[PDB]
mmCIF file of C-alpha atoms in Angstrom:
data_model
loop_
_atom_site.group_PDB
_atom_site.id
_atom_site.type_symbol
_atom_site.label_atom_id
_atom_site.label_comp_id
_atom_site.label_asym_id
_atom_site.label_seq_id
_atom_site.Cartn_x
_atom_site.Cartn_y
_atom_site.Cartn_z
ATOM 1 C CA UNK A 1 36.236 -74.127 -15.731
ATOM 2 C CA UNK A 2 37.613 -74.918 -19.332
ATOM 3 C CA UNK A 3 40.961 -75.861 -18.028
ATOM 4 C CA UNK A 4 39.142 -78.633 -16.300
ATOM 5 C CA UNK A 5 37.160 -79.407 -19.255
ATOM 6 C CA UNK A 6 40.134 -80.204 -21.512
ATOM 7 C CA UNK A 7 41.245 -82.741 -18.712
ATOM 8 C CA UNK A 8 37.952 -83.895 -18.346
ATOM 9 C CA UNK A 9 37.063 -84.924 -22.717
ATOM 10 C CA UNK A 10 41.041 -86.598 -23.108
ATOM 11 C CA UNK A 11 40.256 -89.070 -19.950
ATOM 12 C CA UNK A 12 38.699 -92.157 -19.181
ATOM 13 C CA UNK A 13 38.768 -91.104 -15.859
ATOM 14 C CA UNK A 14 40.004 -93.317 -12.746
ATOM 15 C CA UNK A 15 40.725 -92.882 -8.990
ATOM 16 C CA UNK A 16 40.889 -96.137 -8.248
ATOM 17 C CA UNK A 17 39.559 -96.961 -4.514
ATOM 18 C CA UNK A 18 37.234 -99.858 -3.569
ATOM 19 C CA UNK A 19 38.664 -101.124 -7.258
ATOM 20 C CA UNK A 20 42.520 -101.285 -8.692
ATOM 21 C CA UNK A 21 44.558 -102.292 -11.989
ATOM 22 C CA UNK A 22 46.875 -104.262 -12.489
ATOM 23 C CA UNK A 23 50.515 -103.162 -13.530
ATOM 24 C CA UNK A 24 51.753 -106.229 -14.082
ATOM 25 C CA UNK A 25 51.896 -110.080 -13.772
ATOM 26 C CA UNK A 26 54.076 -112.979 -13.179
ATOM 27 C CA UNK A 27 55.344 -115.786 -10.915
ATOM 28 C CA UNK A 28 52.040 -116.645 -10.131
ATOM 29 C CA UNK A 29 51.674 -112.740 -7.606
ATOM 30 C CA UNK A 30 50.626 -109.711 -9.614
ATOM 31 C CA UNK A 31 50.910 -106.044 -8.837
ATOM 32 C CA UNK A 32 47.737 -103.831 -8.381
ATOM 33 C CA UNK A 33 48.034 -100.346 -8.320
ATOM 34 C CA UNK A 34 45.405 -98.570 -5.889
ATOM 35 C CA UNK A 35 43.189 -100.587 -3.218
ATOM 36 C CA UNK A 36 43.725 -97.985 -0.687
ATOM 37 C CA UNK A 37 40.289 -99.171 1.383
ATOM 38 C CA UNK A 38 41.785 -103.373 1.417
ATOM 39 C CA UNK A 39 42.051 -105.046 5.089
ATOM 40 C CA UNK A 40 45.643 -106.541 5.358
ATOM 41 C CA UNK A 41 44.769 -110.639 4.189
ATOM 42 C CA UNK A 42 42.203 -109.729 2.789
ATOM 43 C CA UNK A 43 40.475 -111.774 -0.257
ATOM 44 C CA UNK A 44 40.005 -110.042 -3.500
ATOM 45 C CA UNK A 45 38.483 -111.289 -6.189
ATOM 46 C CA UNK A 46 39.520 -110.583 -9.891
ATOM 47 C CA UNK A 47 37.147 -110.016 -12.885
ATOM 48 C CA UNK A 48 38.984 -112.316 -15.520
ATOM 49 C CA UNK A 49 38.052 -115.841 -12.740
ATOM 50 C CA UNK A 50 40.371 -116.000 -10.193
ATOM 51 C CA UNK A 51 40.503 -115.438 -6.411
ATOM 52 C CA UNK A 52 43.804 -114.060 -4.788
ATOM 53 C CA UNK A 53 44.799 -113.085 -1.215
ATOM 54 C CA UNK A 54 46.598 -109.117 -1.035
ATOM 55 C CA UNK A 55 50.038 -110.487 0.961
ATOM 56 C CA UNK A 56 52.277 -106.888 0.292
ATOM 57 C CA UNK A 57 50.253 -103.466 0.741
ATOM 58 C CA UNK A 58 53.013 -100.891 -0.017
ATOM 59 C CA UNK A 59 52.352 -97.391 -0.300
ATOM 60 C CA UNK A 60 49.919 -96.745 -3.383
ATOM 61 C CA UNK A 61 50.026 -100.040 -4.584
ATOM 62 C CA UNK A 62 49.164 -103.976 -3.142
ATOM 63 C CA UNK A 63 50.294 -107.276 -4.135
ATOM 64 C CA UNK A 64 48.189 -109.644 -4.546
ATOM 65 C CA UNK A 65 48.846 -113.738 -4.902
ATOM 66 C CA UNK A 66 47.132 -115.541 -7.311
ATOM 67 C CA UNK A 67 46.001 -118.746 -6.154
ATOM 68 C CA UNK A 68 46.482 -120.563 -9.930
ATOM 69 C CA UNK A 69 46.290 -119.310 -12.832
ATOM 70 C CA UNK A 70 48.307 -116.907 -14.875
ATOM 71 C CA UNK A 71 46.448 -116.615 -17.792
ATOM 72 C CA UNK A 72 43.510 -114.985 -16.998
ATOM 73 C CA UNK A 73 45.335 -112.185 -15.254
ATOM 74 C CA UNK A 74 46.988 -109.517 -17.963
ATOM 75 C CA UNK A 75 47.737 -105.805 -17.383
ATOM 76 C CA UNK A 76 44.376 -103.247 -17.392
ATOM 77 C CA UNK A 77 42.372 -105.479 -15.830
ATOM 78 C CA UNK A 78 39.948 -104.834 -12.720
ATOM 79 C CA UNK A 79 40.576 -106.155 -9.101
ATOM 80 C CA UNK A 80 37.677 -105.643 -6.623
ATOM 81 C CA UNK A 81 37.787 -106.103 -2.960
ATOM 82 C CA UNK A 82 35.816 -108.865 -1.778
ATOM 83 C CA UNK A 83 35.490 -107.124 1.731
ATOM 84 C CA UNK A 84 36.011 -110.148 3.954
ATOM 85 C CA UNK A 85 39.280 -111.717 5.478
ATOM 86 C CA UNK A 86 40.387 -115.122 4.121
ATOM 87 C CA UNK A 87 38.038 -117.536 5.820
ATOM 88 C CA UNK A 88 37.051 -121.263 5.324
ATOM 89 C CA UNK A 89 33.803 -123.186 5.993
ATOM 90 C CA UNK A 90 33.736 -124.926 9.186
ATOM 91 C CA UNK A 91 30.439 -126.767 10.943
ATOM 92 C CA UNK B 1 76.281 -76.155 -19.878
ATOM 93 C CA UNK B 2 75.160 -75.922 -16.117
ATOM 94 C CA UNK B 3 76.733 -73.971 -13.486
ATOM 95 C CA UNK B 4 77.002 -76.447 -10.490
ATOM 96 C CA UNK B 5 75.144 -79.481 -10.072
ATOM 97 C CA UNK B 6 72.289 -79.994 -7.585
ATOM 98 C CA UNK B 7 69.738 -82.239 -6.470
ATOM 99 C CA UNK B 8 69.841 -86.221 -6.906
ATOM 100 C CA UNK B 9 67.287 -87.620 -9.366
ATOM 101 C CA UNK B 10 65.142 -85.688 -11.392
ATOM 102 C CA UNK B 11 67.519 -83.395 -11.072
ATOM 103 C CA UNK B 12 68.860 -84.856 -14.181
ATOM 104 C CA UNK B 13 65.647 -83.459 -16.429
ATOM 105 C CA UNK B 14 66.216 -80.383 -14.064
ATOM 106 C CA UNK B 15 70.326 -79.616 -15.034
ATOM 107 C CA UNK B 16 69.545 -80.812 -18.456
ATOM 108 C CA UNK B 17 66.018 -77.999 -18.989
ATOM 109 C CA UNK B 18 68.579 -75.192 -17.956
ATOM 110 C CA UNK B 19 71.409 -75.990 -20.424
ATOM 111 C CA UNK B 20 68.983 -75.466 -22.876
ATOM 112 C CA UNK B 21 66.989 -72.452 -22.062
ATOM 113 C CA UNK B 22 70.665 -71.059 -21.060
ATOM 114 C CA UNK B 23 71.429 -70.077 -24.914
ATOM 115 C CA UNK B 24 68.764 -67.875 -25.532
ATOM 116 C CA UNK B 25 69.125 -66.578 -22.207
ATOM 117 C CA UNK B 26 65.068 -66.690 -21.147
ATOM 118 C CA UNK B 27 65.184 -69.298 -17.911
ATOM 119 C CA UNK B 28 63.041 -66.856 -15.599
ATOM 120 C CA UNK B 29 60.674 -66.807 -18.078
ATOM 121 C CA UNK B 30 60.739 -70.572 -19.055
ATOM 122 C CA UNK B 31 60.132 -71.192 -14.937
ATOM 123 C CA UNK B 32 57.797 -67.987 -14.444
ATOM 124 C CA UNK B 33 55.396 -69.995 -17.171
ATOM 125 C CA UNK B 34 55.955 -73.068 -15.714
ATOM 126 C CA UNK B 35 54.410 -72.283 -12.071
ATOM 127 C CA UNK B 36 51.423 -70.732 -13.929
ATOM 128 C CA UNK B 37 50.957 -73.979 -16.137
ATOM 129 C CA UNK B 38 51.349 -76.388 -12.664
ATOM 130 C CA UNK B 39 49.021 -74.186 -10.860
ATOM 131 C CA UNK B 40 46.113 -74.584 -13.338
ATOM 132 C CA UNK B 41 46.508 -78.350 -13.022
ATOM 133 C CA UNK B 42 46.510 -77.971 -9.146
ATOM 134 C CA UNK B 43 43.433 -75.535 -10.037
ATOM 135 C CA UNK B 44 41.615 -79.080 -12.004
ATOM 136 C CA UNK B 45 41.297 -81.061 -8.189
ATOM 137 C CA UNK B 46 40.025 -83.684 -10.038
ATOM 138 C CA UNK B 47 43.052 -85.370 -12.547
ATOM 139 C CA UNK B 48 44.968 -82.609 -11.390
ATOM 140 C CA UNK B 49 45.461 -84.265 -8.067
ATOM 141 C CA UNK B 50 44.054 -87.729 -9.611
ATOM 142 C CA UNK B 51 46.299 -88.280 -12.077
ATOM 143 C CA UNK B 52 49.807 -87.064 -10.861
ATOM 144 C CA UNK B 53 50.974 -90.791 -10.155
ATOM 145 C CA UNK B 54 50.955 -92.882 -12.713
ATOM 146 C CA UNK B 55 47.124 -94.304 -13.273
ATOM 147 C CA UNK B 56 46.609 -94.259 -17.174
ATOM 148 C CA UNK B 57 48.369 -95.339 -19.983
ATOM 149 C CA UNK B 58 51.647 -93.138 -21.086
ATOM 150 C CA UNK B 59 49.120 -92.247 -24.165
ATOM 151 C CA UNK B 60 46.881 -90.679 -22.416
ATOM 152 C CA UNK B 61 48.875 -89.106 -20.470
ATOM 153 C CA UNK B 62 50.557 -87.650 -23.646
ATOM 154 C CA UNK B 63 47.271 -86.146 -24.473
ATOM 155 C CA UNK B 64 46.789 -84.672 -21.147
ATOM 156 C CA UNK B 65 50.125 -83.126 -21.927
ATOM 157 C CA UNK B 66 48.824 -81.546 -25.389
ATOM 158 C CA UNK B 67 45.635 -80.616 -23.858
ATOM 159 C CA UNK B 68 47.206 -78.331 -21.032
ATOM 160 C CA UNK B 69 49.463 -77.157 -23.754
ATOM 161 C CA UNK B 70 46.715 -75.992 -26.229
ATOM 162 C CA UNK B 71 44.772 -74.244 -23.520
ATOM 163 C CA UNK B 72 48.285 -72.478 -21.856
ATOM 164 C CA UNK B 73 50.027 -70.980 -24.902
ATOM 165 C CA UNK B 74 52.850 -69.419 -22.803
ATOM 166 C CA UNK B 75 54.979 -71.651 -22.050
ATOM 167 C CA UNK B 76 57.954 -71.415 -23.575
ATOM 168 C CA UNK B 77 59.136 -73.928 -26.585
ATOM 169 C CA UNK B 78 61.539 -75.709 -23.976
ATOM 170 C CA UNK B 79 59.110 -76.610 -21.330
ATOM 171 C CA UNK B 80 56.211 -77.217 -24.092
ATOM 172 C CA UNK B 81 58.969 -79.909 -25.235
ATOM 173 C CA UNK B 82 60.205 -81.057 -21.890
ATOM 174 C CA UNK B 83 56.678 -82.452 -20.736
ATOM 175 C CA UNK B 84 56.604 -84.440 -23.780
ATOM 176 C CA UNK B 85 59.395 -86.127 -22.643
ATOM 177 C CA UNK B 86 57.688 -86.914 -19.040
ATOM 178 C CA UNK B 87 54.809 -87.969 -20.624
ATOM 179 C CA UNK B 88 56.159 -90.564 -22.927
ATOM 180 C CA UNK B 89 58.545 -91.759 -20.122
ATOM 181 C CA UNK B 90 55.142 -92.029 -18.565
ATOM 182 C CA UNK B 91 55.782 -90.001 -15.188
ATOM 183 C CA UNK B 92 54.277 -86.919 -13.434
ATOM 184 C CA UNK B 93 54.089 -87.608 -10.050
ATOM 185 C CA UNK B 94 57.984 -85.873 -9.684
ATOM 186 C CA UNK B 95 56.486 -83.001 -11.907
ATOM 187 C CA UNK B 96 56.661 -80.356 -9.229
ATOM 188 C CA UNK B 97 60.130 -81.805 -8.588
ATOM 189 C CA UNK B 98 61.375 -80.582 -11.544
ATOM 190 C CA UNK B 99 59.717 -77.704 -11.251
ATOM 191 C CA UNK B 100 61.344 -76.780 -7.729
ATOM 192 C CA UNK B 101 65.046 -77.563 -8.303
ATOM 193 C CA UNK B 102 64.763 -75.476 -11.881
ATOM 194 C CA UNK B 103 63.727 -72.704 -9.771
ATOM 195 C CA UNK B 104 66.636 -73.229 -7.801
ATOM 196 C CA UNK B 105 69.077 -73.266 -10.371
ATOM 197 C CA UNK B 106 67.161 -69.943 -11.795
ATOM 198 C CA UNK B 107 67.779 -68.096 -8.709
ATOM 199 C CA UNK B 108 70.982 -69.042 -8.665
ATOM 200 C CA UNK B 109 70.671 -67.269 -12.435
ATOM 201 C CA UNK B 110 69.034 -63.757 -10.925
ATOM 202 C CA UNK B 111 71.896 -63.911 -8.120
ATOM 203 C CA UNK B 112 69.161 -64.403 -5.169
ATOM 204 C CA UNK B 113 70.161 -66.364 -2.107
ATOM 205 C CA UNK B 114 67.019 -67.728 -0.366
ATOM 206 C CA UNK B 115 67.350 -68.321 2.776
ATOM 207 C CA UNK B 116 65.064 -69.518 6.090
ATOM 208 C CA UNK B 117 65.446 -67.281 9.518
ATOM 209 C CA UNK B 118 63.275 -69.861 11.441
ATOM 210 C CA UNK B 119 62.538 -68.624 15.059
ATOM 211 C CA UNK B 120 60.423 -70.198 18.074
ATOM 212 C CA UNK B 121 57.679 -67.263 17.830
ATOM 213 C CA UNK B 122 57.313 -64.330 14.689
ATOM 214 C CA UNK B 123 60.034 -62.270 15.376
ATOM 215 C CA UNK B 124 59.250 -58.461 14.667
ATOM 216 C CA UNK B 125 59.989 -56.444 11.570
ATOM 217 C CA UNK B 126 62.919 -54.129 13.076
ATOM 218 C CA UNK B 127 64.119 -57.738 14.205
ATOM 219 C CA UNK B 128 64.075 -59.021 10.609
ATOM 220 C CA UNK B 129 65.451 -55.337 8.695
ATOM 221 C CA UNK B 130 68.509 -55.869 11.614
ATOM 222 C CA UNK B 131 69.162 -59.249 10.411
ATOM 223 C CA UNK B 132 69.347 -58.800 6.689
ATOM 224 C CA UNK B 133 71.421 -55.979 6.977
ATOM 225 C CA UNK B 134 74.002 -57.937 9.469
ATOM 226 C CA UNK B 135 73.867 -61.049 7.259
ATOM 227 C CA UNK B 136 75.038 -58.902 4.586
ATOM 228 C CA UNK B 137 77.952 -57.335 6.543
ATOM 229 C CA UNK B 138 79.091 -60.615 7.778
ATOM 230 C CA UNK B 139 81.270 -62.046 5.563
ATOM 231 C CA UNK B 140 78.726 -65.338 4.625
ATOM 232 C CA UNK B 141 77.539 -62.941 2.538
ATOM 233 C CA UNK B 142 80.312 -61.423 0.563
ATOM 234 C CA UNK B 143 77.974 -59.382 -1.615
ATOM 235 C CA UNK B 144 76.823 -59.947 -5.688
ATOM 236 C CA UNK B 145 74.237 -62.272 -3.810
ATOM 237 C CA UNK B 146 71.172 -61.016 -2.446
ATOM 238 C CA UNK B 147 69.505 -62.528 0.477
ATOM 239 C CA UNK B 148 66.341 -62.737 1.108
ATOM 240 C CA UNK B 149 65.015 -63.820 4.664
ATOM 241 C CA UNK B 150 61.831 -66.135 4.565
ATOM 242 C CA UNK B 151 60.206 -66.050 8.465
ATOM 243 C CA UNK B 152 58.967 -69.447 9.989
ATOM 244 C CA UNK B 153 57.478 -70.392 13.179
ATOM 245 C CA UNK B 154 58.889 -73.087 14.412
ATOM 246 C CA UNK B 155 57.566 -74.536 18.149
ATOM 247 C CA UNK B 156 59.643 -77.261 17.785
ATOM 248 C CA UNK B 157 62.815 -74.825 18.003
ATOM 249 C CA UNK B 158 62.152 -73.946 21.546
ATOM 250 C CA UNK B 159 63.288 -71.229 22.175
ATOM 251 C CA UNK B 160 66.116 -69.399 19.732
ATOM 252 C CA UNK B 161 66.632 -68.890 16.179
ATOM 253 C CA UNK B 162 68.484 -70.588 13.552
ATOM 254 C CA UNK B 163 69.763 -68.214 10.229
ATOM 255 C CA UNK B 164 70.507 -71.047 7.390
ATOM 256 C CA UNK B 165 71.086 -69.850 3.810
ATOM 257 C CA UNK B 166 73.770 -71.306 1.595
ATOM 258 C CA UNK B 167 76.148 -73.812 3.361
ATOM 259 C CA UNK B 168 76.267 -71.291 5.941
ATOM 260 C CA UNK B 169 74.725 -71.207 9.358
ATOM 261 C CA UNK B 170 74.802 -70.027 12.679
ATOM 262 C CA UNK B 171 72.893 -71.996 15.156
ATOM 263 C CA UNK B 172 72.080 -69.478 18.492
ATOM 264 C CA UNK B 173 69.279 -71.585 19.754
ATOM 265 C CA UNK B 174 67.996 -72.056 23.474
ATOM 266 C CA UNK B 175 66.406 -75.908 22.222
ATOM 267 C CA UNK B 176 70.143 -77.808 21.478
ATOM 268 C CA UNK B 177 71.546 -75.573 24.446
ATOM 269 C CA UNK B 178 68.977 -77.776 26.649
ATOM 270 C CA UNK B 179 69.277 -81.333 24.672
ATOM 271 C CA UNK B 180 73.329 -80.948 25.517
ATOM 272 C CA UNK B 181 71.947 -79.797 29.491
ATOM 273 C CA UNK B 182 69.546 -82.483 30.087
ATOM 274 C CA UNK B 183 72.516 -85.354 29.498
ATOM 275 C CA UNK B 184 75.039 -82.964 31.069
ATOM 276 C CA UNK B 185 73.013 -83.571 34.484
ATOM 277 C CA UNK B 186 74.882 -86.032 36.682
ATOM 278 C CA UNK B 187 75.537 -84.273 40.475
#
């Protein structure tokens, strides 16, 4: 319809599940918004070259803990699930 | 100025959109517009249910706004000015919340006193013409109010009825009767 259509040309579109962004940073934990699909400990990975491990899900957004850095992490930027529980090598 | 003050927060944007559009003296229209406006972003499922909590920037947001503005001319200038103000506080997930407690304070406006008859089971329609014409001889009802009766099936209300409208009530269930029974039980 054209009342969808106007939406549709003023957006960059979103949804944001099986991918978040971030809403903002600091203290070394940052605050995703989305990540509806994430396991509870899971590990996420960031696009900027960091890892971090979602500690608070909360309704409609998760917290994630950056595990150093706080540099490469800014607002806008794209968190992607991993898909896989925090886990070490062992053998 | 308002009448009475309702609601918590976002009833603040609510009190405040009625003092305004009280001068002219054009609220049911203001709210009429309004519903039709929400309903044709309900009507875009996509970034009409996808973007009601916060997910882009307050910019484009904004333009959201202007876009449902240029494509819904009715609107009234008070609500065509009000979502700006949402928009560049960068909020529209307590949209509809606005929207419901300015309907409230309208009604109170037209003089109409809504009001929920819930039952166990659909009562029948003699039932419900009996009712509103008692409600408005009991004094809860003075008169200068109009009530309306809304019917609601309620299983969870077993047994009964409950009449609620106002701060008034009268409670002549079977359900509570049985609650207050089952602890009664000792011998």
């Amino acid at each position: 319809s054209i009342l969808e259509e106007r939406i549709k040309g003023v957006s960059d579109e979103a949804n944001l599940n099986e991918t978040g962004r971030v809403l903002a940073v600091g203290d070394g934990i940052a605050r995703v918004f989305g990540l509806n699909n994430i396991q509870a400990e899971e590990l996420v990975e960031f696009s900027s070259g960091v890892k971090g491990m979602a500690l608070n899900l909360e309704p409609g957004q998760v917290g994630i803990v950056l595990f150093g850095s706080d540099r490469l992490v800014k607002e806008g930027e794209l968190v992607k699930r991993t898909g896989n529980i925090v886990d070490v090598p062992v053998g | 100025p308002p009448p009475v003050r309702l609601f918590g927060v976002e009833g603040t944007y609510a009190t405040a959109l009625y003092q305004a559009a009280a001068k002219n003296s054009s609220i049911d229209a203001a709210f009429q517009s309004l519903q039709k406006v929400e309903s044709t972003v309900k009507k875009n499922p996509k970034l009409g249910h996808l973007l009601l909590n916060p997910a882009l920037s307050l910019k484009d947001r904004n333009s959201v706004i202007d876009a449902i503005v240029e494509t819904h001319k009715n609107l009234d200038g008070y609500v065509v000015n009000l979502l700006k103000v949402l928009s560049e506080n960068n909020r529209l997930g307590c949209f509809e919340k606005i929207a419901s407690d300015f309907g409230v304070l309208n009604d109170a406006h037209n003089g109409l006193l809504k009001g929920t008859v819930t039952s166990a089971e659909p009562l029948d329609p003699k039932s419900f013409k009996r009712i509103e014409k008692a409600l408005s001889a009991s004094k809860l009802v003075g008169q200068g109010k109009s009530l309306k009766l809304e019917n609601v099936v309620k299983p969870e209300i077993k047994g009964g009825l409950i009449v609620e409208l106002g701060d008034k009530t009268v409670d002549l269930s079977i359900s509570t009767k049985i609650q207050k029974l089952n602890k009664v039980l000792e011998d």
